[PDB]
Design a protein around this ligand. Structure first.
Ligand SMILES: OCCc1ccccc1
Ligand SMILES: [Cl-]
Ligand SMILES: [Cl-]
Ligand SMILES: [Cl-]
Ligand code: NA
Length: 129
């Protein structure tokens, strides 16, 4: 599914991301834009042979099982395929664990490089929520 901007903002707020670990909703929307273009089916292979999955490009190196990332962990206790669903529940639940792991949203290098320190409220401007 490719979400609209405000549609995704809504969905993320319903699933409890607004101000989760102190990160306003616009931070989450900005990260999803640059990670996936709001496409739940996004995947990208990393250099090490891990894969990033879904709207927030969650990495099989640590967070999910895809059976093809030697040595990796599955800390969210899910198949990586769950992160590609039209329903963002699994992605959100796993993101809450990631953002809680000490580095905050710096876990997402694209957030650090493209969202952090910008006017992230622009991503939810106009949205009914
Ligand atoms: O942008 C990297 C590409 C990628 C996506 C899914 C599986 C392998 C590769
Ligand atoms: Cl915001
Ligand atoms: Cl594996
Ligand atoms: Cl933090
Ligand atoms: Na894994």
């Amino acid at each position: 599914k490719v979400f609209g901007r405000c549609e995704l903002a809504a969905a993320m707020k319903r699933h409890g991301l607004d101000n989760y670990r102190g990160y306003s909703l616009g931070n989450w929307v900005c990260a999803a834009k640059f990670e996936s273009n709001f496409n739940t089916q996004a995947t990208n292979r990393n250099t090490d042979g891990s894969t990033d999955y879904g709207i927030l490009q969650i990495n099989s190196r640590w967070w999910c099982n895809d059976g093809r990332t030697p040595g990796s962990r599955n800390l969210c206790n899910i198949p990586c395929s769950a992160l590609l669903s039209s329903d963002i529940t699994a992605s959100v639940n796993c993101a809450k664990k990631i953002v809680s792991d000490g580095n905050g949203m710096n876990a997402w290098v694209a957030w650090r490089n493209r969202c952090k320190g910008t006017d992230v409220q622009a991503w939810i401007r106009g949205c009914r929520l």
